[PDB]
């Protein structure tokens, strides 16, 4: 037999947000794991500053 | 097979071609110029007919969904560039029978090429309606064949009569009215079909 | 026998999969496609890297237990 | 002054009227500053494209006034008309979808014929040939012009 | 009215918080000193394992007043040398294409990734321009190492 | 006979050589089989109306153990006989292992493919099924060794192609 153990399901709150907003309804879930803390709302990102964070490096390696 | 311009070397090349055709993936061959660089560059070359085509008796014998327009556009091309080369008009009877040994095997050649192509992909070519007179020309270079004194030539030619008369009788065993969709097609050309059973009939 | 494996999707989605050692992959895909109401056809799989094929079996790569299957969406151009 | 009402309708026996000013009245009329005008024009042109002897010459050298006007132009980028061209016969996509024309007979012969003159740029040569090798509905119905301009494409 | 702009939000929040490594996808601010959500510039790394790795294309992406119903439109700047990218540099996707495969669920996050998974896959049978497809199709070897060049030339 | 051509003889063991050569030789017919040892060189002399023509025919062996200087067998040869067996499979699955090897040597030389035993009932190689000939343009025939069928086909074939004639026939003498 082949089955489905489980699956992931943000809150209710965020089920009817992505519902208003026709979003996947596992949208929400990364605010909903560990280590979250309070949203930052500044935004006061350039393009520039996004490359230069990446400091070259873009890729993974083992 | 592109700046050459050395007949062994390219012939050579050629040569190996078509033993790579056997295995190689098809994408080497479908997603390239490999069809129109053998069809315009080396077909009409006398030199270089009879591997040519038996480049592309190989092509044409790959039976695949994913490519139906590149065979498509391998037989109006290759139908094309064999009326310039072999005139509808031509008795090839009486060429064939006093003709050098090239010409006799781009003959057998050309027979196996019209036998395996339609075989195949009839469907396809049928299916085009804008392909109908293409068609009805590969059919007379196929009875034009026919004729040839040659036992090896006329079963070649004859194992595909037998194959479309089948398929005609299994869509409908019934004598001529409506009348079945692909009858219709052939229905302008089968009398001469059985002229040709008629007249070439071999001994019990 | 019958082991637990981690797909992650391309919505940074993560899902936990019951299955045998001979049992075929493709019942668990068409789930995963099923998910976000999308069909077979759409959704790709990677398991360490090449793709697995529909009708493959866990037993030729050996996954283990809790192992990690990568998800992708093939584009199709125009 | 009928060279625009022509152009409007164009007709094959519309073309002969103009006699032989119409190998420059075309190429002067039209506006050969942006390749899409020079493409209307030289689509419009072969339109009228038959075998009759008379007609064929005079689209012909039409044609070749027309690009030889065109071709001489250093603001003219010819990657730009070659793309225009391929996507108004429909051998190409387009952003903006303009309707594909339904013949291509004409256009493919007034194409085999330039292809031959010593304006065409030698660097266009493989994207016709890669187009015109690629297989498409609109080109299987003229199968003679589609394998003509093969040829001479790969006679260059 | 509000639904775009609350959507655009909080796309944006969960990118801030959660997005792929080397994508970016930074909201461009409105000149006024604010922030303009019709109009994103965005960076896709070239997939690892591919030609078009070591490399970081820019991506502008404008939205629509009626989005999520109608698709975003993604122009690469300066254009790539793609069969399925055109010459402005709009990207043809059939997930971007409104009437194909287009779904208000899809998000950017997955739209860039369609768009990576893109660069490694092109679409020969169908090409959006004409340089690009030429040069696949005759030499494969060349048109890897165009690519290999643009992506060195486009790295960081 | 002044013009002499050299024709190779090969094919799987047991399928006939042997016999079909010394039926022409001697017109008896051999009814035990004896594995040849390396080659034997047998000089036939037929009369074609344009005159007389010789064949120095070398009968291989088609047992692996008895192969000899296998492939140096083929130097220099002009014409040649692949022979299998119509009650055999597995004789005719190795014809194309046989024909590489025959033009590895000699690229170009008129090849004859003989189905030998075709007077057997039980035939398990089809008529249908003989198709390798055809893309590499070799001629073919159905012969018996036993009942002289299509006895003389095969060299009156190679005898027009390399004469040049096709109006060519054998008249006995
Ligand atoms: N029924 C029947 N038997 C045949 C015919 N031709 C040959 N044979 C038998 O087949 C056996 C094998 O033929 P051979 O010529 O001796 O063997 P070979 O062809 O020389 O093969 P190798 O010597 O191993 O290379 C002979 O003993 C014959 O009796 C035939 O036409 N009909
Ligand atoms: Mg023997």
Redesign the pocket.
Same mark, same amino acid.
């Given at each position: 037999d082949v089955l489905i153990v489980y699956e992931l399901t943000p809150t209710a709150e965020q089920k009817a947000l992505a519902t208003k907003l026709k979003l996947p309804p596992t949208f929400f879930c990364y605010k909903n794991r560990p280590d979250y803390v309070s949203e930052e709302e500044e935004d006061d990102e350039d393009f520039e500053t996004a490359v230069k964070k990446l400091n070259g490096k873009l890729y993974l390696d083992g | 097979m592109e700046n050459s311009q050395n007949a062994p070397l390219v012939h050579a090349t050629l040569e190996t071609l078509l033993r790579f055709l056997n295995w190689i993936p098809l994408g080497y061959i479908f997603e390239t110029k490999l069809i129109s660089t053998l069809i315009y560059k080396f077909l009409n070359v006398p030199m270089f007919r009879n591997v040519s085509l038996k480049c592309l008796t190989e092509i044409a014998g790959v039976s695949v969904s994913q490519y139906e327009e590149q065979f498509v556009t391998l037989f109006t091309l290759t139908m094309m560039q064999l009326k310039q080369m072999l005139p509808l008009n031509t008795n090839i009877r009486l060429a064939y029978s006093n003709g050098k040994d090239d010409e006799q095997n781009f003959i057998q050649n050309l027979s196996l090429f019209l036998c395996t192509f339609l075989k195949e992909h009839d469907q396809l070519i049928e299916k085009r309606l804008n392909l109908r007179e293409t068609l009805m020309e590969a059919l007379h270079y196929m009875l034009l064949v026919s004729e040839v004194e040659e036992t090896e030539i006329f079963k070649i030619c004859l194992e595909y009569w037998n194959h479309l008369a089948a398929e005609l009788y299994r869509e409908s065993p019934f004598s001529t009215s409506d009348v079945p969709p692909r009858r219709q097609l052939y229905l302008p050309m089968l009398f001469k079909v059985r002229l040709l059973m008629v007249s070439r009939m071999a001994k019990p | 026998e019958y082991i637990k494996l981690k797909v992650i999707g391309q919505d940074s989605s993560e899902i936990h999969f019951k299955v045998k050692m001979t049992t075929h992959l493709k019942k668990l895909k068409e789930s995963y496609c099923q998910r976000q109401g999308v069909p077979m056809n759409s959704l790709r799989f990677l398991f360490e890297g090449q793709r697995i094929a529909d009708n493959h079996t866990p037993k030729e790569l050996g996954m283990e237990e809790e192992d990690v299957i990568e998800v992708y969406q093939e584009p199709t151009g125009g | 002054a009928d060279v625009s009402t022509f152009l409007a309708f164009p007709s094959p026996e519309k073309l002969l009227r103009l006699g032989p000013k119409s190998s420059v009245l075309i190429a002067q009329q039209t506006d050969t500053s942006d390749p899409e005008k020079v493409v209307s024009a030289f689509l419009k042109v072969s339109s009228v494209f038959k075998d009759e002897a008379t007609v064929r010459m005079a689209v012909q050298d039409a044609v070749d006034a027309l690009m030889q006007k065109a071709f001489n132009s250093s603001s003219f980028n010819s990657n730009t008309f070659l793309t225009r061209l391929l996507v108004h016969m429909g051998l190409l996509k387009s952003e903006d979808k303009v309707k594909a024309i339904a013949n291509l007979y004409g256009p493919l012969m007034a194409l085999n014929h330039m292809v031959q003159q010593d304006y065409f740029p030698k660097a266009l040569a493989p994207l016709l040939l890669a187009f015109v090798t690629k297989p498409n509905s609109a080109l299987e119905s003229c199968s003679f012009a589609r394998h003509s301009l093969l040829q001479t494409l790969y006679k260059v | 009215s509000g639904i775009a702009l609350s959507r655009l939000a909080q796309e944006r929040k969960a990118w801030r918080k959660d997005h792929p490594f080397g994508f970016v996808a930074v909201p461009t601010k409105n000149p006024d000193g604010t922030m303009n959500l019709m109009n994103w510039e965005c960076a896709i790394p070239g997939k690892k394992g591919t030609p078009w790795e070591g490399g970081l294309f820019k991506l502008r992406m404008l939205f629509k007043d009626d989005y999520p119903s109608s698709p975003p439109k993604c122009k690469f700047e300066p254009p790539l040398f793609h069969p399925n990218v055109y010459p402005s540099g709009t990207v043809c996707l059939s997930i971007l294409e409104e009437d194909k495969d287009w779904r208000p669920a899809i998000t950017i996050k997955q739209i860039l990734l369609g768009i990576q998974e893109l660069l490694n896959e092109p679409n020969i049978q169908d090409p959006a321009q004409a340089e690009a497809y030429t040069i696949y199709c005759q030499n494969r070897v060349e048109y890897e190492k165009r690519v290999r060049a643009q992506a060195k030339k486009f790295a960081p | 006979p002044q013009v002499q051509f050299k024709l190779v003889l090969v094919? &799987?063991?047991? =399928?006939? *050589? =042997? =016999?079909?050569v010394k039926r022409h030789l001697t017109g008896e017919?051999?009814?035990?089989?004896? @594995?040849?040892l390396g080659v034997e060189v047998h000089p036939l002399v037929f009369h074609t109306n344009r005159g007389p023509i010789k064949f120095n025919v070398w &009968?291989? @062996?088609?047992?692996e153990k008895?192969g000899g200087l296998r492939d140096g067998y083929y130097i220099q040869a002009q014409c040649a006989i692949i022979?299998f067996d119509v009650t055999s499979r597995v004789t005719y699955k190795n014809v194309p292992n046989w024909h590489r090897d025959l033009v590895r040597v000699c690229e170009n030389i008129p090849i004859v493919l003989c189905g030998?035993?075709? &007077? $057997?009932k039980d035939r398990k190689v089809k008529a249908k099924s003989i198709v390798f000939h055809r893309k590499k343009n070799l001629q073919y025939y159905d $012969?018996?060794? *036993?009942?002289n069928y299509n006895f003389e086909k095969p060299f009156l074939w190679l005898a027009r192609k390399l004469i040049g004639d096709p109006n060519l026939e054998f008249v006995a003498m």
């Open positions: - | - | - | - | - | 094919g &799987d063991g047991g =399928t006939g *050589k =042997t =016999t079909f017919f051999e009814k035990k089989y004896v @594995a040849t &009968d291989t @062996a088609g047992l008895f022979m030998n035993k075709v &007077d $057997i $012969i018996s060794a *036993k009942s």
